[PDB]
Amino acid sequence: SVIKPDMKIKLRMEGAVNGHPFAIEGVGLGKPFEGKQSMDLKVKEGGPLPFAYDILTTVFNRVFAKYPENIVDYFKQSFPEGYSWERSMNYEDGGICNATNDITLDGDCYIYEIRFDGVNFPANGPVMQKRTVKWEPSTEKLYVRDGVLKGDVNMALSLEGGGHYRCDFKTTYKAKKVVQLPDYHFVDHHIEIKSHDKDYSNVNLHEHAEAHSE
Ligand SMILES: [Co+2]
Ligand SMILES: [Co+2]
């Protein structure tokens, strides 16, 4: 046991985009072995957010990915101690976000302490003009480096005017104890904002993920 079929999530994120700060909290649930999850998210400070919520959504846990038995699962093995990660998100227009998640487990509920910091998004660009629609589904590429796990992914935001806005994600995953390291593999993801109020003070977010290799 320790990884149960059904588990819960609470989180807090504190952050800032272009020096304007904000914080959001949320609760949710999901199935680790099915790679599915969902959550509700409320802006507690800095609302109404003046930039595209989509930049936050991949920051709001790779335990919720379906691993087959022939690929080692760095994430499920890491609990109950858990793990953290860091990431920079490098947008084609020179906007850059750094984020971190510290993940712990209390009973059947994961707990995330998130930091998010974005800078240099142009005023006319699609993040600050809120011209984004969704992330496309993706394939993350995961490899070992210096004893820890890396995950790189080419991501794309569909723009409401048509076309896409590209971002490169480089994530380092750090387990809090010794676990077995996997060989090169992939994680397919698909993240969707399933509902939201007008200024996104409330968001319902969904993701499903599946590992594969060879
Ligand atoms: Co899908
Ligand atoms: Co909408």
Side-chain angles (χ1 to χ4, degrees):
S1 184
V2 39
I3 311 288
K4 311 293 192 305
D6 296 271
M7 295 229 238
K8 303 196 284 164
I9 296 163
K10 53 201 76 219
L11 64 82
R12 186 171 165 91
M13 157 190 305
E14 304 191 9
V17 167
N18 288 0
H20 280 81
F22 63 96
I24 299 181
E25 262 170 6
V27 300
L29 74 203
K31 286 126 178 289
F33 299 106
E34 295 173 58
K36 302 172 127 61
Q37 64 173 118
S38 77
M39 60 193 74
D40 300 291
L41 293 153
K42 309 199 167 214
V43 172
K44 297 317 203 187
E45 303 158 54
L49 294 175
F51 59 74
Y53 205 96
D54 279 312
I55 74 167
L56 305 176
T57 55
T58 69
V59 176
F60 299 128
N61 182 356
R62 206 70 61 262
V63 274
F64 293 109
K66 206 231 93 205
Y67 270 80
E69 230 295 277
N70 78 302
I71 307 174
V72 344
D73 188 339
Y74 185 83
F75 307 99
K76 288 186 177 67
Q77 284 185 53
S78 76
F79 290 91
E81 288 82 348
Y83 82 97
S84 53
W85 58 251
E86 314 150 42
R87 179 188 304 167
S88 46
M89 283 161 290
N90 171 31
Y91 289 85
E92 62 175 299
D93 61 353
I96 317 274
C97 304
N98 289 342
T100 69
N101 194 353
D102 197 5
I103 297 160
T104 41
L105 173 70
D106 175 14
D108 66 332
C109 184
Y110 295 104
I111 313 196
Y112 310 164
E113 185 186 320
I114 288 153
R115 188 67 207 174
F116 194 93
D117 296 87
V119 298
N120 282 337
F121 285 97
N124 306 334
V127 169
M128 301 313 290
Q129 292 289 333
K130 293 172 184 194
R131 277 190 287 90
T132 75
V133 175
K134 56 187 255 81
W135 292 105
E136 297 287 353
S138 60
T139 293
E140 161 172 41
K141 275 76 178 282
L142 296 100
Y143 55 107
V144 166
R145 186 159 298 181
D146 306 337
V148 295
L149 195 54
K150 302 263 160 144
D152 296 349
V153 53
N154 287 310
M155 297 284 280
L157 291 163
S158 164
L159 305 179
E160 60 96 28
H164 290 71
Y165 174 60
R166 278 276 286 104
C167 181
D168 290 336
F169 282 22
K170 283 173 202 309
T171 305
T172 306
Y173 303 104
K174 278 163 174 174
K176 280 163 182 151
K177 55 149 164 186
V178 166
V179 293
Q180 300 187 18
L181 303 168
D183 305 326
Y184 201 89
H185 68 281
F186 312 86
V187 175
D188 293 334
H189 298 267
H190 182 199
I191 195 193
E192 327 165 63
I193 286 192
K194 264 298 222 312
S195 53
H196 63 101
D197 56 28
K198 47 238 287 191
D199 51 18
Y200 294 84
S201 84
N202 293 271
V203 173
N204 187 238
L205 178 62
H206 263 70
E207 188 202 338
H208 75 76
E210 301 84 35
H212 52 104
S213 62
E214 270 246 314

mmCIF file of all heavy atoms in Angstrom, residues 119-168:
data_model
loop_
_atom_site.group_PDB
_atom_site.id
_atom_site.type_symbol
_atom_site.label_atom_id
_atom_site.label_comp_id
_atom_site.label_asym_id
_atom_site.label_seq_id
_atom_site.Cartn_x
_atom_site.Cartn_y
_atom_site.Cartn_z
ATOM 1 N N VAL A 119 8.849 36.397 -15.167
ATOM 2 C CA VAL A 119 9.260 37.780 -15.467
ATOM 3 C C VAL A 119 9.391 37.924 -16.945
ATOM 4 O O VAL A 119 9.348 36.974 -17.662
ATOM 5 C CB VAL A 119 10.611 38.165 -14.806
ATOM 6 C CG1 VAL A 119 10.496 38.096 -13.280
ATOM 7 C CG2 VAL A 119 11.719 37.282 -15.322
ATOM 8 N N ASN A 120 9.534 39.171 -17.351
ATOM 9 C CA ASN A 120 9.704 39.566 -18.685
ATOM 10 C C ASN A 120 8.658 39.170 -19.708
ATOM 11 O O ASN A 120 8.993 39.092 -20.909
ATOM 12 C CB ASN A 120 11.077 39.099 -19.093
ATOM 13 C CG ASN A 120 12.163 40.007 -18.546
ATOM 14 O OD1 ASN A 120 11.924 41.232 -18.219
ATOM 15 N ND2 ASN A 120 13.353 39.448 -18.454
ATOM 16 N N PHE A 121 7.422 38.913 -19.288
ATOM 17 C CA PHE A 121 6.359 38.812 -20.273
ATOM 18 C C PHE A 121 5.980 40.123 -20.907
ATOM 19 O O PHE A 121 5.503 40.967 -20.215
ATOM 20 C CB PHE A 121 5.116 38.265 -19.643
ATOM 21 C CG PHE A 121 5.204 36.856 -19.393
ATOM 22 C CD1 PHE A 121 5.559 36.401 -18.169
ATOM 23 C CD2 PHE A 121 5.058 35.963 -20.424
ATOM 24 C CE1 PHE A 121 5.621 35.026 -17.929
ATOM 25 C CE2 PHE A 121 5.100 34.607 -20.194
ATOM 26 C CZ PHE A 121 5.395 34.149 -18.951
ATOM 27 N N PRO A 122 6.155 40.280 -22.232
ATOM 28 C CA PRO A 122 5.751 41.563 -22.838
ATOM 29 C C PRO A 122 4.255 41.882 -22.633
ATOM 30 O O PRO A 122 3.423 40.977 -22.577
ATOM 31 C CB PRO A 122 6.080 41.357 -24.336
ATOM 32 C CG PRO A 122 7.095 40.282 -24.333
ATOM 33 C CD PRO A 122 6.582 39.344 -23.280
ATOM 34 N N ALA A 123 3.982 43.160 -22.454
ATOM 35 C CA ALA A 123 2.642 43.743 -22.167
ATOM 36 C C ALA A 123 1.619 43.416 -23.240
ATOM 37 O O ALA A 123 0.458 43.143 -22.925
ATOM 38 C CB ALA A 123 2.767 45.267 -22.005
ATOM 39 N N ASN A 124 2.099 43.305 -24.481
ATOM 40 C CA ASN A 124 1.282 43.003 -25.647
ATOM 41 C C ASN A 124 1.235 41.543 -25.992
ATOM 42 O O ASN A 124 0.649 41.180 -27.010
ATOM 43 C CB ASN A 124 1.891 43.626 -26.888
ATOM 44 C CG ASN A 124 2.141 45.082 -26.738
ATOM 45 O OD1 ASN A 124 1.473 45.755 -25.942
ATOM 46 N ND2 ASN A 124 3.126 45.605 -27.511
ATOM 47 N N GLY A 125 1.941 40.714 -25.234
ATOM 48 C CA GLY A 125 2.057 39.366 -25.615
ATOM 49 C C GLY A 125 0.843 38.632 -25.146
ATOM 50 O O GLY A 125 0.061 39.177 -24.398
ATOM 51 N N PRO A 126 0.731 37.374 -25.499
ATOM 52 C CA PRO A 126 -0.508 36.621 -25.193
ATOM 53 C C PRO A 126 -0.782 36.192 -23.760
ATOM 54 O O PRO A 126 -1.950 35.771 -23.417
ATOM 55 C CB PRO A 126 -0.360 35.331 -26.024
ATOM 56 C CG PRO A 126 1.062 35.237 -26.381
ATOM 57 C CD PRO A 126 1.638 36.629 -26.395
ATOM 58 N N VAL A 127 0.263 36.191 -22.931
ATOM 59 C CA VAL A 127 0.067 35.837 -21.525
ATOM 60 C C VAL A 127 -0.622 37.014 -20.788
ATOM 61 O O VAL A 127 -1.644 36.826 -20.167
ATOM 62 C CB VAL A 127 1.427 35.406 -20.863
ATOM 63 C CG1 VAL A 127 1.288 35.289 -19.358
ATOM 64 C CG2 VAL A 127 1.894 34.070 -21.460
ATOM 65 N N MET A 128 -0.034 38.198 -20.864
ATOM 66 C CA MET A 128 -0.552 39.409 -20.239
ATOM 67 C C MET A 128 -1.791 40.007 -20.924
ATOM 68 O O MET A 128 -2.527 40.819 -20.291
ATOM 69 C CB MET A 128 0.512 40.545 -20.283
ATOM 70 C CG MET A 128 1.837 40.218 -19.592
ATOM 71 S SD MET A 128 1.683 39.489 -17.955
ATOM 72 C CE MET A 128 1.065 40.956 -17.096
ATOM 73 N N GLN A 129 -1.957 39.709 -22.222
ATOM 74 C CA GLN A 129 -3.205 40.018 -22.941
ATOM 75 C C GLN A 129 -4.257 38.928 -22.833
ATOM 76 O O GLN A 129 -5.341 39.056 -23.372
ATOM 77 C CB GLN A 129 -2.907 40.277 -24.396
ATOM 78 C CG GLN A 129 -2.121 41.542 -24.551
ATOM 79 C CD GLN A 129 -2.931 42.784 -24.262
ATOM 80 O OE1 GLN A 129 -4.168 42.823 -24.419
ATOM 81 N NE2 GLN A 129 -2.232 43.825 -23.867
ATOM 82 N N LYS A 130 -3.950 37.874 -22.110
ATOM 83 C CA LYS A 130 -4.871 36.774 -21.933
ATOM 84 C C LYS A 130 -5.423 36.298 -23.224
ATOM 85 O O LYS A 130 -6.627 36.257 -23.383
ATOM 86 C CB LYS A 130 -6.010 37.171 -20.981
ATOM 87 C CG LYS A 130 -5.526 37.396 -19.572
ATOM 88 C CD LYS A 130 -6.638 37.975 -18.751
ATOM 89 C CE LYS A 130 -6.170 38.311 -17.368
ATOM 90 N NZ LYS A 130 -7.385 38.548 -16.557
ATOM 91 N N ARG A 131 -4.537 35.931 -24.161
ATOM 92 C CA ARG A 131 -4.975 35.431 -25.438
ATOM 93 C C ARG A 131 -4.851 33.924 -25.547
ATOM 94 O O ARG A 131 -4.906 33.382 -26.639
ATOM 95 C CB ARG A 131 -4.246 36.204 -26.568
ATOM 96 C CG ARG A 131 -4.971 37.535 -26.832
ATOM 97 C CD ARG A 131 -4.519 38.287 -28.078
ATOM 98 N NE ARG A 131 -3.196 38.884 -27.869
ATOM 99 C CZ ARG A 131 -2.000 38.306 -28.131
ATOM 100 N NH1 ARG A 131 -1.906 37.066 -28.674
ATOM 101 N NH2 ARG A 131 -0.881 38.986 -27.846
ATOM 102 N N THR A 132 -4.718 33.228 -24.430
ATOM 103 C CA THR A 132 -4.478 31.814 -24.503
ATOM 104 C C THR A 132 -5.754 31.020 -24.293
ATOM 105 O O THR A 132 -6.656 31.446 -23.583
ATOM 106 C CB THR A 132 -3.347 31.283 -23.523
ATOM 107 O OG1 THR A 132 -3.818 31.236 -22.184
ATOM 108 C CG2 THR A 132 -2.126 32.174 -23.516
ATOM 109 N N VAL A 133 -5.764 29.819 -24.863
ATOM 110 C CA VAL A 133 -6.938 28.973 -24.924
ATOM 111 C C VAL A 133 -6.745 27.704 -24.117
ATOM 112 O O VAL A 133 -7.542 27.415 -23.259
ATOM 113 C CB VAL A 133 -7.316 28.645 -26.400
ATOM 114 C CG1 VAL A 133 -8.470 27.658 -26.494
ATOM 115 C CG2 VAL A 133 -7.705 29.931 -27.100
ATOM 116 N N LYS A 134 -5.683 26.977 -24.404
ATOM 117 C CA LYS A 134 -5.334 25.771 -23.694
ATOM 118 C C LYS A 134 -3.889 25.352 -24.017
ATOM 119 O O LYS A 134 -3.341 25.735 -25.056
ATOM 120 C CB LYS A 134 -6.255 24.636 -24.145
ATOM 121 C CG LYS A 134 -6.237 24.383 -25.649
ATOM 122 C CD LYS A 134 -7.278 23.363 -26.122
ATOM 123 C CE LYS A 134 -6.693 21.997 -26.472
ATOM 124 N NZ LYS A 134 -6.425 21.080 -25.292
ATOM 125 N N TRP A 135 -3.300 24.507 -23.178
ATOM 126 C CA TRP A 135 -2.136 23.749 -23.579
ATOM 127 C C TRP A 135 -2.506 22.646 -24.490
ATOM 128 O O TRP A 135 -3.488 21.989 -24.249
ATOM 129 C CB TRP A 135 -1.453 23.086 -22.381
ATOM 130 C CG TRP A 135 -0.851 24.057 -21.479
ATOM 131 C CD1 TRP A 135 -1.329 24.437 -20.267
ATOM 132 C CD2 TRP A 135 0.367 24.750 -21.676
ATOM 133 N NE1 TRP A 135 -0.471 25.327 -19.692
ATOM 134 C CE2 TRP A 135 0.583 25.537 -20.532
ATOM 135 C CE3 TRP A 135 1.321 24.769 -22.696
ATOM 136 C CZ2 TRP A 135 1.655 26.425 -20.420
ATOM 137 C CZ3 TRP A 135 2.411 25.637 -22.559
ATOM 138 C CH2 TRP A 135 2.581 26.422 -21.428
ATOM 139 N N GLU A 136 -1.637 22.317 -25.475
ATOM 140 C CA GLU A 136 -1.849 21.075 -26.231
ATOM 141 C C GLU A 136 -1.395 19.924 -25.388
ATOM 142 O O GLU A 136 -0.542 20.102 -24.518
ATOM 143 C CB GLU A 136 -1.121 21.057 -27.565
ATOM 144 C CG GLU A 136 -1.579 22.130 -28.568
ATOM 145 C CD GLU A 136 -2.951 21.829 -29.182
ATOM 146 O OE1 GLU A 136 -3.559 20.742 -28.972
ATOM 147 O OE2 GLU A 136 -3.414 22.682 -29.920
ATOM 148 N N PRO A 137 -1.938 18.720 -25.634
ATOM 149 C CA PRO A 137 -1.396 17.575 -25.018
ATOM 150 C C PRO A 137 0.076 17.413 -25.414
ATOM 151 O O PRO A 137 0.484 17.819 -26.519
ATOM 152 C CB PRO A 137 -2.224 16.395 -25.594
ATOM 153 C CG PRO A 137 -3.302 16.943 -26.432
ATOM 154 C CD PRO A 137 -2.994 18.413 -26.616
ATOM 155 N N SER A 138 0.846 16.769 -24.535
ATOM 156 C CA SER A 138 2.314 16.671 -24.679
ATOM 157 C C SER A 138 2.950 15.335 -24.409
ATOM 158 O O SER A 138 2.332 14.405 -23.886
ATOM 159 C CB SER A 138 3.036 17.727 -23.833
ATOM 160 O OG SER A 138 2.799 17.658 -22.450
ATOM 161 N N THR A 139 4.211 15.238 -24.822
ATOM 162 C CA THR A 139 5.008 14.136 -24.451
ATOM 163 C C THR A 139 6.288 14.588 -23.793
ATOM 164 O O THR A 139 7.207 15.097 -24.446
ATOM 165 C CB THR A 139 5.282 13.203 -25.611
ATOM 166 O OG1 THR A 139 4.072 12.587 -25.991
ATOM 167 C CG2 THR A 139 6.143 12.094 -25.164
ATOM 168 N N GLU A 140 6.363 14.352 -22.482
ATOM 169 C CA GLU A 140 7.554 14.667 -21.721
ATOM 170 C C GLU A 140 8.582 13.582 -21.829
ATOM 171 O O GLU A 140 8.258 12.376 -21.860
ATOM 172 C CB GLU A 140 7.192 14.930 -20.235
ATOM 173 C CG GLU A 140 8.355 14.823 -19.241
ATOM 174 C CD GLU A 140 7.998 15.285 -17.824
ATOM 175 O OE1 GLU A 140 6.901 14.954 -17.380
ATOM 176 O OE2 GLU A 140 8.804 15.970 -17.163
ATOM 177 N N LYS A 141 9.840 14.004 -21.839
ATOM 178 C CA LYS A 141 10.953 13.090 -21.996
ATOM 179 C C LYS A 141 11.746 13.138 -20.728
ATOM 180 O O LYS A 141 12.194 14.223 -20.323
ATOM 181 C CB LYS A 141 11.881 13.504 -23.140
ATOM 182 C CG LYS A 141 11.470 13.021 -24.522
ATOM 183 C CD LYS A 141 10.303 13.785 -25.149
ATOM 184 C CE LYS A 141 10.001 13.255 -26.577
ATOM 185 N NZ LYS A 141 10.959 13.748 -27.649
ATOM 186 N N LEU A 142 11.918 11.960 -20.138
ATOM 187 C CA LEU A 142 12.485 11.847 -18.822
ATOM 188 C C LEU A 142 13.750 11.018 -18.863
ATOM 189 O O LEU A 142 13.764 9.944 -19.431
ATOM 190 C CB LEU A 142 11.542 11.206 -17.824
ATOM 191 C CG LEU A 142 10.279 11.982 -17.551
ATOM 192 C CD1 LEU A 142 9.138 11.362 -18.383
ATOM 193 C CD2 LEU A 142 9.917 11.888 -16.085
ATOM 194 N N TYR A 143 14.812 11.574 -18.266
ATOM 195 C CA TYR A 143 16.102 10.911 -18.239
ATOM 196 C C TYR A 143 16.804 11.193 -16.946
ATOM 197 O O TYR A 143 16.587 12.207 -16.297
ATOM 198 C CB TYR A 143 16.951 11.370 -19.401
ATOM 199 C CG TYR A 143 17.150 12.869 -19.492
ATOM 200 C CD1 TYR A 143 18.334 13.463 -19.181
ATOM 201 C CD2 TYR A 143 16.122 13.681 -19.896
ATOM 202 C CE1 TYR A 143 18.512 14.863 -19.288
ATOM 203 C CE2 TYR A 143 16.277 15.048 -20.002
ATOM 204 C CZ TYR A 143 17.448 15.636 -19.693
ATOM 205 O OH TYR A 143 17.523 17.015 -19.811
ATOM 206 N N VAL A 144 17.689 10.300 -16.575
ATOM 207 C CA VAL A 144 18.502 10.534 -15.387
ATOM 208 C C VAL A 144 19.675 11.471 -15.627
ATOM 209 O O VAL A 144 20.361 11.412 -16.653
ATOM 210 C CB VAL A 144 18.958 9.205 -14.839
ATOM 211 C CG1 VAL A 144 20.071 9.353 -13.809
ATOM 212 C CG2 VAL A 144 17.768 8.591 -14.122
ATOM 213 N N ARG A 145 19.940 12.299 -14.649
ATOM 214 C CA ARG A 145 21.177 13.058 -14.636
ATOM 215 C C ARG A 145 21.706 13.348 -13.241
ATOM 216 O O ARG A 145 20.936 13.784 -12.375
ATOM 217 C CB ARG A 145 21.025 14.361 -15.373
ATOM 218 C CG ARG A 145 22.402 15.006 -15.420
ATOM 219 C CD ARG A 145 22.508 16.008 -16.507
ATOM 220 N NE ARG A 145 22.315 15.467 -17.877
ATOM 221 C CZ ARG A 145 22.406 16.228 -18.932
ATOM 222 N NH1 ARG A 145 22.712 17.486 -18.760
ATOM 223 N NH2 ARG A 145 22.196 15.764 -20.132
ATOM 224 N N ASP A 146 23.018 13.170 -13.045
ATOM 225 C CA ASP A 146 23.645 13.307 -11.749
ATOM 226 C C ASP A 146 22.796 12.691 -10.632
ATOM 227 O O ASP A 146 22.513 13.368 -9.655
ATOM 228 C CB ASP A 146 23.843 14.786 -11.392
ATOM 229 C CG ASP A 146 24.586 15.541 -12.428
ATOM 230 O OD1 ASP A 146 25.331 14.884 -13.202
ATOM 231 O OD2 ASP A 146 24.429 16.786 -12.485
ATOM 232 N N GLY A 147 22.359 11.437 -10.780
ATOM 233 C CA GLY A 147 21.624 10.778 -9.697
ATOM 234 C C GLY A 147 20.205 11.258 -9.450
ATOM 235 O O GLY A 147 19.489 10.682 -8.620
ATOM 236 N N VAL A 148 19.714 12.228 -10.216
ATOM 237 C CA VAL A 148 18.322 12.638 -10.056
ATOM 238 C C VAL A 148 17.627 12.507 -11.408
ATOM 239 O O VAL A 148 18.309 12.177 -12.417
ATOM 240 C CB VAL A 148 18.227 14.051 -9.442
ATOM 241 C CG1 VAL A 148 18.774 14.014 -8.028
ATOM 242 C CG2 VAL A 148 18.965 15.107 -10.282
ATOM 243 N N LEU A 149 16.307 12.753 -11.441
ATOM 244 C CA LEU A 149 15.509 12.604 -12.675
ATOM 245 C C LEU A 149 15.243 13.956 -13.317
ATOM 246 O O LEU A 149 14.819 14.920 -12.635
ATOM 247 C CB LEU A 149 14.180 12.001 -12.372
ATOM 248 C CG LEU A 149 13.400 11.468 -13.565
ATOM 249 C CD1 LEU A 149 14.189 10.474 -14.417
ATOM 250 C CD2 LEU A 149 12.104 10.795 -13.084
ATOM 251 N N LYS A 150 15.453 14.010 -14.626
ATOM 252 C CA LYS A 150 15.069 15.180 -15.394
ATOM 253 C C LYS A 150 13.883 14.896 -16.281
ATOM 254 O O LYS A 150 13.681 13.771 -16.701
ATOM 255 C CB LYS A 150 16.196 15.593 -16.266
ATOM 256 C CG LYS A 150 17.427 15.889 -15.505
ATOM 257 C CD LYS A 150 17.537 17.354 -15.266
ATOM 258 C CE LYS A 150 18.480 17.547 -14.110
ATOM 259 N NZ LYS A 150 19.288 18.760 -14.325
ATOM 260 N N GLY A 151 13.129 15.946 -16.597
ATOM 261 C CA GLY A 151 11.972 15.840 -17.463
ATOM 262 C C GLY A 151 11.964 17.083 -18.312
ATOM 263 O O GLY A 151 11.854 18.184 -17.773
ATOM 264 N N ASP A 152 12.113 16.900 -19.635
ATOM 265 C CA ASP A 152 11.980 17.961 -20.600
ATOM 266 C C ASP A 152 10.770 17.804 -21.538
ATOM 267 O O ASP A 152 10.493 16.734 -22.002
ATOM 268 C CB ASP A 152 13.272 18.033 -21.404
ATOM 269 C CG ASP A 152 14.491 18.419 -20.531
ATOM 270 O OD1 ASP A 152 14.295 18.836 -19.341
ATOM 271 O OD2 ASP A 152 15.646 18.283 -21.031
ATOM 272 N N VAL A 153 10.094 18.903 -21.854
ATOM 273 C CA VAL A 153 8.911 18.866 -22.711
ATOM 274 C C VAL A 153 8.724 20.155 -23.530
ATOM 275 O O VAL A 153 8.839 21.296 -22.987
ATOM 276 C CB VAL A 153 7.634 18.487 -21.881
ATOM 277 C CG1 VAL A 153 7.427 19.373 -20.663
ATOM 278 C CG2 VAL A 153 6.361 18.433 -22.728
ATOM 279 N N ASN A 154 8.494 19.974 -24.852
ATOM 280 C CA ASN A 154 8.098 21.077 -25.734
ATOM 281 C C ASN A 154 6.652 21.304 -25.568
ATOM 282 O O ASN A 154 5.876 20.477 -25.975
ATOM 283 C CB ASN A 154 8.320 20.762 -27.235
ATOM 284 C CG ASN A 154 9.783 20.775 -27.631
ATOM 285 O OD1 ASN A 154 10.487 21.707 -27.340
ATOM 286 N ND2 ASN A 154 10.226 19.735 -28.293
ATOM 287 N N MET A 155 6.250 22.431 -25.020
ATOM 288 C CA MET A 155 4.815 22.676 -24.797
ATOM 289 C C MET A 155 4.288 23.762 -25.732
ATOM 290 O O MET A 155 5.068 24.622 -26.202
ATOM 291 C CB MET A 155 4.601 23.142 -23.354
ATOM 292 C CG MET A 155 4.973 22.138 -22.306
ATOM 293 S SD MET A 155 3.720 20.847 -22.195
ATOM 294 C CE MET A 155 2.509 21.773 -21.196
ATOM 295 N N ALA A 156 2.980 23.733 -25.996
ATOM 296 C CA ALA A 156 2.324 24.734 -26.840
ATOM 297 C C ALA A 156 0.929 25.178 -26.352
ATOM 298 O O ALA A 156 0.016 24.369 -26.091
ATOM 299 C CB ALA A 156 2.223 24.227 -28.265
ATOM 300 N N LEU A 157 0.772 26.487 -26.270
ATOM 301 C CA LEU A 157 -0.506 27.074 -26.020
ATOM 302 C C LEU A 157 -1.205 27.499 -27.330
ATOM 303 O O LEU A 157 -0.778 28.414 -28.063
ATOM 304 C CB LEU A 157 -0.417 28.272 -25.061
ATOM 305 C CG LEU A 157 -0.066 27.955 -23.601
ATOM 306 C CD1 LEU A 157 0.363 29.234 -22.977
ATOM 307 C CD2 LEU A 157 -1.272 27.432 -22.845
ATOM 308 N N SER A 158 -2.356 26.890 -27.550
ATOM 309 C CA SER A 158 -3.278 27.362 -28.574
ATOM 310 C C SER A 158 -3.683 28.835 -28.305
ATOM 311 O O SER A 158 -3.981 29.192 -27.187
ATOM 312 C CB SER A 158 -4.451 26.410 -28.578
ATOM 313 O OG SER A 158 -5.536 26.957 -29.240
ATOM 314 N N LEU A 159 -3.619 29.702 -29.297
ATOM 315 C CA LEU A 159 -4.016 31.096 -29.098
ATOM 316 C C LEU A 159 -5.422 31.316 -29.681
ATOM 317 O O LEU A 159 -5.724 30.819 -30.745
ATOM 318 C CB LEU A 159 -3.060 32.053 -29.788
ATOM 319 C CG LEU A 159 -1.583 31.890 -29.407
ATOM 320 C CD1 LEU A 159 -0.670 32.873 -30.160
ATOM 321 C CD2 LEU A 159 -1.529 32.046 -27.884
ATOM 322 N N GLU A 160 -6.258 32.084 -28.990
ATOM 323 C CA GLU A 160 -7.606 32.351 -29.456
ATOM 324 C C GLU A 160 -7.658 32.932 -30.891
ATOM 325 O O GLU A 160 -8.629 32.693 -31.613
ATOM 326 C CB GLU A 160 -8.347 33.250 -28.451
ATOM 327 C CG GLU A 160 -7.680 34.606 -28.240
ATOM 328 C CD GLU A 160 -8.262 35.729 -29.089
ATOM 329 O OE1 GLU A 160 -9.473 35.656 -29.433
ATOM 330 O OE2 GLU A 160 -7.497 36.694 -29.383
ATOM 331 N N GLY A 161 -6.648 33.704 -31.300
ATOM 332 C CA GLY A 161 -6.595 34.216 -32.692
ATOM 333 C C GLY A 161 -6.101 33.193 -33.733
ATOM 334 O O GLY A 161 -5.957 33.530 -34.900
ATOM 335 N N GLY A 162 -5.861 31.950 -33.308
ATOM 336 C CA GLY A 162 -5.251 30.904 -34.118
ATOM 337 C C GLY A 162 -3.758 30.872 -33.879
ATOM 338 O O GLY A 162 -3.124 31.865 -33.467
ATOM 339 N N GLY A 163 -3.150 29.752 -34.158
ATOM 340 C CA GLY A 163 -1.683 29.678 -34.061
ATOM 341 C C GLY A 163 -1.310 29.201 -32.673
ATOM 342 O O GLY A 163 -2.206 28.928 -31.860
ATOM 343 N N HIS A 164 -0.017 29.087 -32.403
ATOM 344 C CA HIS A 164 0.458 28.621 -31.109
ATOM 345 C C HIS A 164 1.567 29.460 -30.608
ATOM 346 O O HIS A 164 2.231 30.102 -31.386
ATOM 347 C CB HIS A 164 0.936 27.153 -31.162
ATOM 348 C CG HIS A 164 -0.170 26.188 -31.341
ATOM 349 N ND1 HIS A 164 -0.851 26.073 -32.519
ATOM 350 C CD2 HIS A 164 -0.761 25.330 -30.475
ATOM 351 C CE1 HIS A 164 -1.786 25.139 -32.392
ATOM 352 N NE2 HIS A 164 -1.787 24.714 -31.142
ATOM 353 N N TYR A 165 1.798 29.352 -29.293
ATOM 354 C CA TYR A 165 2.840 30.051 -28.538
ATOM 355 C C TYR A 165 3.557 28.984 -27.781
ATOM 356 O O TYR A 165 2.965 28.234 -26.985
ATOM 357 C CB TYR A 165 2.174 30.967 -27.559
ATOM 358 C CG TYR A 165 3.015 31.720 -26.563
ATOM 359 C CD1 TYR A 165 4.014 32.611 -26.967
ATOM 360 C CD2 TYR A 165 2.648 31.728 -25.241
ATOM 361 C CE1 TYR A 165 4.701 33.367 -26.032
ATOM 362 C CE2 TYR A 165 3.288 32.511 -24.324
ATOM 363 C CZ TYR A 165 4.325 33.340 -24.707
ATOM 364 O OH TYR A 165 4.972 34.068 -23.735
ATOM 365 N N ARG A 166 4.827 28.884 -28.050
ATOM 366 C CA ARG A 166 5.610 27.741 -27.622
ATOM 367 C C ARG A 166 6.356 28.076 -26.317
ATOM 368 O O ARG A 166 6.857 29.233 -26.095
ATOM 369 C CB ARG A 166 6.623 27.398 -28.724
ATOM 370 C CG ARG A 166 6.089 26.566 -29.867
ATOM 371 C CD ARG A 166 6.104 25.068 -29.551
ATOM 372 N NE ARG A 166 7.479 24.652 -29.630
ATOM 373 C CZ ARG A 166 8.285 24.401 -28.585
ATOM 374 N NH1 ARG A 166 7.846 24.438 -27.346
ATOM 375 N NH2 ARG A 166 9.558 24.094 -28.798
ATOM 376 N N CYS A 167 6.518 27.055 -25.515
ATOM 377 C CA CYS A 167 7.357 27.132 -24.281
ATOM 378 C C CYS A 167 8.167 25.853 -24.029
ATOM 379 O O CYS A 167 7.692 24.719 -24.224
ATOM 380 C CB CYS A 167 6.450 27.383 -23.056
ATOM 381 S SG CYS A 167 7.238 27.534 -21.426
ATOM 382 N N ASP A 168 9.386 26.029 -23.559
ATOM 383 C CA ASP A 168 10.204 24.859 -23.223
ATOM 384 C C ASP A 168 10.292 24.715 -21.692
ATOM 385 O O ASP A 168 10.697 25.675 -21.047
ATOM 386 C CB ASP A 168 11.626 25.027 -23.762
ATOM 387 C CG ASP A 168 11.724 24.946 -25.288
ATOM 388 O OD1 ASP A 168 10.837 24.323 -25.921
ATOM 389 O OD2 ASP A 168 12.721 25.511 -25.831
#
